[PDB]
């Protein structure tokens, strides 16, 4: 940039899009997660949230999400607040910065899932606290960072490694891969219909930000050319079905690498039968459960990152 | 059994049923919650559960083995997670095997409420960490060690001892109930109607548990048989009816007895009214609050037992 | 198996082979001798075991397995307790079942060093406490483990590689080896006199892990063919003679890989000038040092895995 | 005594025989044993002999004394220091006196295992503090205690108990036990063959002992009258045999007790088909098992009442 930025700090920072950060934070929060899974794995437990409060307010309900914010949290010390939609309504007896303002007053740290981002970004600014998207409609970083994390388990490094996502290649998920992917100096494709190509606004922004880490994004409805080579092949679910049917990871498709080891991956719950078959993502190149455990892991270091 | 087997570390076993475990291990249970419940009575705080986290999944809700689980877990510094009905529907938007795989790799242990039996065994094994039954329709495991506890506190001893369960004698309750009763030499009847008689091949069981033991298990539909020196009068809600009136236990049922030192026990709630009179429940042989009690030191006993 | 089973948790588990272990079992019982490693290097001080004993049977003695269990358990504050030979021998004053009920009653732990795998599965079964074999005459577990860490050192990666492994190829740390490689996903080599070709029942379930694994495992009394393209060449001692004499690793067979990269390895103790030259574990490409190293990590990792 | 002597204090004793203890500081040292077993069940750690060294000197080995020595002292963070015959020929290279007051500058307290009596009483007396008998020739102190402790468990009292110690009834076990029994008002019978009748000024300092108590202790070669209404049947080894051939513990002398609560007991090892046969000490009224745990913690209590 002239002068380039590479600060690596983070303390204080809300994580509402991956968009928000650099590679070189990006990578700082990859090694915290690093350490923190070998730590939790060899039993070494210590107690950095001691005496802390994390609000996670659920406008859409999601058990991984809430397990991994939860088991983080707490294996730490700190004490989590499961505000489900039973509990909380938005927009409905409170607008939402009244709340906001509250919950500044009264926590360390807010986790919203839901719909709009505007609603995480107006959390962030009226309580003061950093704030954690743990998924809208628009952007999911958390899974995006577990992701990352397994693929460097997997191959050792990132600045390679070619990713191609299958089939709705705009909803959240794929979106936040793409950037996180783009960060990282991976090869990024997206693949699927072109009703449903990737957002075009946050495919611009992904390759100025390739320019600098020489990465690649791309977007192509022929399956053949998507995936030779592929190292990683992702999806997610699909809710017209009829677009998205050909994009079905199944073993013909994982063949079409050409590689041997290529893994799957996919951010869970899914529809088996769909968008991807029993047979592939209960079988050898499947790290759909490293994955997951993964997500815990991201989240404690992006908890450590800000609040430390 | 040419060499006899007679370990007592239980340390990674998951409880699903008494079937499961041996007299000395059961005894080894009840040493370990007569000891918690001293430490808790005498404010002797300890935190044996510290950075631990335990998953709750309630098909069915209830407060008490909610209370019970999420007390005994926190006040050794464990954090406990209620997922509810509203939180998980384990068929629906997964498969129990997907949602096990994921719990395993955040959690060090899962309790379990709710219908089949099948479920817990699968969360077991596809965890692979330490589930615990919190009630099936089968076998409500750790109601029978807070009772066993309970008659122990009251008599100084078990394998004497004579007790009655009136009524539904092959719901889950009646059922765990007879095995502690076999496992630790007791001498237990089972008296209601003949359709609801225990269920036959826990019953032989039993008949195989007592010979090494010197307990006895037994069925009639005569109350008078039955309650001849019962040193406990134990019942449980009745949801026909019909078949069901004779056997509620009141003043007359008691007095049966022939002793005056004979207790009532319920695990709760109650009907009272319907199986028990609320002259007899809340009156000077029921021990029924302190029985709630012990499913607290009972539930701490079975967590210090298998985690650490 | 339509329902992949992927779970990590070890907690109450013995080691008697590598058999009984899952490659996600073992591969998070190599990240725990990773993390354990850099912990001891760092000199981060920690007492993971502080109030826990382990009883250590040495039917056979060693000093490199004593030190590695005696190390490991007490740098943590676990109190291990040496039983030689001449403190207990198994089968001569009493039975061994009766000694496993006791221990079972006195220790946390029993590590067997010894002859039959029978002895090591009766202590397991008798003493309901872990087990670990420290070697038999059909297994050397702990040695596979420190093995597949050391290459995994030495290459960053373990799914790829070549490994050899001449001479006495049915021994039980050929055997363990063997096993270890075929659940990480490596390609391995027995290469020997065909007198002394690998324990066949091993072998045929080895075939079967590599179809899920993507290893390979093979035999052939042909040097060339063998070592071509080896990335570690890898021996123990002899103790005919006469067959085994043309197996013997010197700067000739070394060669034989094509690859300067090639490491070589020796479980120890080693009869320098007959299974191996002195030039060739004295130089270079040895890497017997920290293959005896890692001995003691992971041995703690296993006992942190099975203990807490 | 005129003025009765009732102290319990015991910091700076020595065990070599239960004739040197009151009943009052014997039910002491049961009540310490009871308390500490509940705590290792229960998993509450304590660090009571952090700092302390132990020096375990083996004139004969046991492994069953060493463990119980050793995991006593090790797991509340003391150093024990296991001598064996190999280290220690304690008349031959040097006095017993320079051996025991070069001990005395160097460790808080001595185990002693071996044939004399005498020489128990040398090392308490040149090496100026505790010393344990952990069995001579004449008395096994630690044993009486843990049998006491397990009888105590399985009555719930002790005062009223009939216990028949069956064969050898002058060796160093039937010597301690008879003690015992006659402090804590037992009644104890002695049933054995004329030629090994009690040791005739133990029995009399019985006599004595009882006539506060109101115990009674007893000898008889006759089975019949021995055993009507014992409470406990114990045994041990009989290294003529032919003397001893009659009272071997078998089914049929279980069954002369008349009452089915009857319990076995041996210290052990035991001869199976000897002394005892396999059916009872592996059949259910066996405490074989329960009684060897309690070495550790009867150990544990005289350890911490003699040292705190």
């Known amino acids: 940039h002239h002068h380039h930025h590479m600060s690596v700090n983070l303390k204080g920072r809300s994580l ?3 968009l928000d950060f650099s590679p070189e934070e990006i990578r700082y929060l990859l090694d915290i997660s690093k350490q923190v899974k070998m730590e939790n794995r060899s039993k070494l437990r210590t107690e950095r949230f001691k005496g802390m409060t994390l609000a996670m307010i659920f406008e859409k309900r ?5 397990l991994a914010f939860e088991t983080a949290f707490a294996e730490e010390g700190g004490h989590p607040i499961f505000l489900s939609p039973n509990d909380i309504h938005l927009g409905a007896k409170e607008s939402l910065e009244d709340t906001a303002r509250v919950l500044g007053r009264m926590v360390d740290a807010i986790m919203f899932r839901g719909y709009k981002q505007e609603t995480v970004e107006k959390l962030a600014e009226y309580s003061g606290v950093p704030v954690y998207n743990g998924l809208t409609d628009e952007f999911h970083p958390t899974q995006a960072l577990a992701d990352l994390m397994t693929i460097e388990e997997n191959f050792g490094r990132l600045k390679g490694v070619k990713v191609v996502f299958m089939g709705d290649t705009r909803n959240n998920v794929a979106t936040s891969l793409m950037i996180a992917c783009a960060k990282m100096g991976m090869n990024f494709v997206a693949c699927g219909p072109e009703e449903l190509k990737p957002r075009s606004d946050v495919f611009k922004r992904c390759q100025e930000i390739v320019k600098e880490t020489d990465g690649s994004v791309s977007f192509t409805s022929n399956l053949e050319e998507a995936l030779a080579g592929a190292d990683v092949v992702y999806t997610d679910v699909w809710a017209r079905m009829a677009l998205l049917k050909p994009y079905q ?8 690498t050409g590689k ?3 893994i799957f991956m996919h951010c869970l719950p ?4 769909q968008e991807v078959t029993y047979e592939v993502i209960e079988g050898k190149q499947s790290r759909v459960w490293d ?10 270091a992006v908890m450590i990152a800000t609040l430390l």
């Not at 990871?249 to 079409?256: F, I, K, Q, S």
């Not at 899914?270 to 039968?273: E, L, T």
């Not at 994955?291 to 404690?300: G, S």
């Open 16 to 18: 509402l899009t991956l």
């Open 270 to 273: 899914a529809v088996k039968g």
């Open 62 to 66: 999601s058990t991984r999400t809430r």
């Open 291 to 300: 994955e997951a455990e993964n997500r815990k892991h991201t989240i404690k």
């Open 260 to 262: 041997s080891e290529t």
């Open 249 to 256: 990871v199944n073993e013909r498709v994982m063949e079409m």
